[PDB]
Ligand binder design. Structure first.
Ligand SMILES: Cc1cc2nc3c(=O)[nH]c(=O)nc-3n(C[C@H](O)[C@H](O)[C@H](O)COP(=O)(O)O)c2cc1C
Ligand code: NA
Lengths: 199, 195, 66, 189
């Protein structure tokens, strides 16, 4: 945080800061927003409670842009236990009561085709809700075999060969290899989606 | 010529530009009024204690209305009409009583019950002063459905919305008596007969 | 039925009926219309997907996350 | 993982893949496959998610609201002038500094701004005049020079021989960068 402030004050081209693995308190957010000359703040709430915390941060700085990066348990790396859809169905209305929240959808996305119904808002139709269009998207896993990522040649081969699974089967990672992915506990006990290598 | 008449309760007042003619009668009501107000407190917290200048003029309209006769015309009629005219200018600004009542709720520290009293006092005052709501309303919603930028459907609730439904009737009869009294009375008589 | 104040402004109370200013005519958002994705052109003729996000950053509304 | 197959695809291709795919679908679904129906703006970006006349004079009191004042000097049409007065920062060669145009035009008692040729941006000239030893004089002249060079002429009317003196500050205006379209010409500055 002090680094960003120092660098930002020498006019470094840092546009924004995204905070991962849970959402700051109002007092800490208020600090990041007002001290670090940032043009927006990214927050990655994992649960319905976390989304409320993001809203209360936006409420408190209603002219400051918040990138609310919504993410499912179906996400890669450190992941939640949450469905990708239910939390957005519950909270979308409350999020859109705050113009300064730029609502971004992440996790399980790879192409224009799978991502488009979330841009249109036609996705929420399937669940007898009105259309709920999203402002943006993030691609984590999809990008890991790009030419210019440092992922080792054999690692890209291994990622590629992962057939992957539809959203309705993603939770089987808790029990067994599913699309060539398992979930697995960190040293602190948080779940992680990793490729089901021997190791 | 005019001549001032301070309506007051603790901190807050309203300077009333009473015509020279009607000052005799007006300052009589002023005096009899000031005693029936309770003692001021901090914040004006007591239930029957006006928190704003608007509420104050409210209570006065309500008092003066109670001394006005519906068939004959007494001496308090020319006073009531000037208090209304003064209230409508200073506090309504051509808007509806309900719009003012909602300002006082968010803006000041008046309670619901003090606001329902304000609405009662102003509407009771309008009818007793022979100034009914004959004019068609400047309602922004109704103008808009008028121009076809809006359309209304009316829905009517059923049983089971609250455990204390009859209080909603009390509130109507107490607040909006001058508007709804005839309807309640008819409904009661109709049901007695049905039995 | 009731006079009261909705802090969320979700819906209105009796005031909204009789109010004469803008405050009488409030419309609830239709999300489809309010957040409809759009297309837009720079002077160079580049096409962007216009959303609340891309409108800020002047780039496609797509990001590689940390 | 079900969408991750093609190894060593350049990142530009993956991302443009997704964006181009959306444009294609949006064009068909809402624009009748017709690129001429897509609205255009000189530059795209710099829009907070919360948010004329050809010849005008603006007088700054001590009450004038900054936001109204800059919105006025900017004009509605999106051009070099809109950026000059609303864009919060400018580039000085990779580094981002506070927009010096907004700094110099921050409103206060005495300031008078005159816009000539408001409705044609190629020719527009905004002229700041302030009190200088009693008599009101021009202190700043903002305009295009060439098509993509903004010039803020900073004027000192208190000089060695009475003849006013000029500092020509020069800024490139590049509408291909919607987020940071104005960047100071640093060479020989
Ligand atoms: C290898 C890897 C590393 C990650 N590292 C971080 C990190 O440092 N901080 C963070 O907030 N999220 C991290 N994430 C989560 C991503 O930001 C993002 O939420 C997720 O990858 C999106 O889901 P998807 O990968 O299914 O598209 C990581 C994800 C992966 C796969
Ligand atoms: Na894969």
């Amino acid at each position: 945080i002090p680094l960003i402030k120092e660098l930002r004050s020498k006019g470094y081209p840092i546009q924004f800061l995204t905070i991962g693995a849970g959402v700051p308190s109002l007092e800490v957010a208020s600090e990041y927003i007002e001290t670090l000359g940032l043009k927006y703040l990214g927050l990655k709430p994992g649960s319905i409670d976390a989304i409320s915390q993001v809203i209360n941060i936006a409420k408190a700085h209603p002219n400051f842009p918040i990138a609310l990066q919504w993410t499912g348990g179906r996400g890669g790396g450190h992941h939640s236990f949450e469905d990708a859809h239910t939390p957005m169905l519950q909270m979308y209305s409350k999020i859109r009561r705050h113009p300064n929240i730029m609502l971004i959808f992440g996790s399980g996305f790879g192409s224009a085709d799978d991502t488009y119904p979330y841009l249109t808002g036609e996705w929420s139709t399937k669940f007898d809700y009105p259309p709920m269009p999203f402002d943006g998207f993030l691609f984590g896993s999809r990008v890991m075999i790009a030419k210019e990522v440092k992922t080792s040649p054999d690692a890209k081969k291994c990622i590629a060969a992962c057939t992957g699974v539809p959203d309705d089967k993603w939770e089987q990672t808790y029990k067994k290899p599913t699309g060539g992915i398992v979930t697995v506990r960190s040293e602190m006990g948080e779940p992680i989606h990793k490729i089901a290598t021997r190791g | 010529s005019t001549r001032p008449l301070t309506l007051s309760h603790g901190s807050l007042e309203h300077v009333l530009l009473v015509p020279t003619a009607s000052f005799f009668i007006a300052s009589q009501l002023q005096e009899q009024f000031n005693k029936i107000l309770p003692e001021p407190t901090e914040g004006f917290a007591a239930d029957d204690e006006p928190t704003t200048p608007a509420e104050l003029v409210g209570k006065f309209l309500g008092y003066v209305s109670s001394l006005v006769e519906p068939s004959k015309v007494g001496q308090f009629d020319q006073v009531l009409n000037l208090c209304l005219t003064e209230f409508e200018n200073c506090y309504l600004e051509g808007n509806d009583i309900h719009a003012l009542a909602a300002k006082l709720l968010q803006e000041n520290d008046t309670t619901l019950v003090k606001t329902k009293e304000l609405i009662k006092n102003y509407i009771t005052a309008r009818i007793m002063a022979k100034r009914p709501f004959d004019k068609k309303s400047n309602s922004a919603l109704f103008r808009a459905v008028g121009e076809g930028n809006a359309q209304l459907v009316a829905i009517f609730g059923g049983q089971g919305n609250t455990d204390d439904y009859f209080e909603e009737l009390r509130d109507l009869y107490q607040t909006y008596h001058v508007l709804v009294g005839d309807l309640i009375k008819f409904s009661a008589e109709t049901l007695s007969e049905l039995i | 039925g009731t006079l009261d104040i909705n802090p969320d402004d979700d819906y209105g109370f009796k005031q909204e009926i009789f109010d004469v200013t803008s405050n009488g005519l409030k419309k609830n958002p239709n999300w489809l219309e309010e957040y409809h994705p759009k297309l837009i052109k720079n002077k160079s003729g580049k096409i962007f997907v216009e959303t609340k996000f891309s409108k800020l950053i002047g780039r496609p509304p797509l990001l590689v996350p940390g | 993982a079900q969408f991750t197959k093609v190894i060593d695809e350049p990142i530009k291709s993956i991302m443009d893949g997704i964006h181009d795919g959306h444009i294609k679908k949006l064009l068909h679904q809402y624009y009748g496959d017709d690129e001429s129906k897509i609205p255009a703006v000189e530059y795209f970006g710099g829009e907070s998610p919360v948010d004329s006349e050809d010849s005008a004079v603006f007088k700054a009191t001590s009450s004038t609201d900054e936001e109204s004042w800059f919105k006025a000097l900017a004009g509605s049409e999106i051009n070099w002038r809109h950026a000059s007065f609303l864009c919060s920062f400018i580039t000085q060669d990779k580094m981002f500094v506070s927009n010096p145009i907004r700094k110099v035009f921050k409103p206060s008692q005495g300031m008078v701004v005159e816009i000539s040729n408001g409705n044609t941006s190629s020719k527009t000239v905004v002229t700041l005049s302030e009190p200088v030893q009693g008599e009101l004089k021009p202190t700043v002249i903002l305009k295009l020079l060439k098509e993509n060079i903004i010039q803020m002429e900073m004027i000192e009317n208190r000089t060695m021989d009475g003849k006013p003196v000029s500092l020509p500050l020069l800024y490139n205006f590049n509408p291909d960068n919607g987020f940071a379209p104005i960047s100071e010409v640093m060479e020989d500055r």
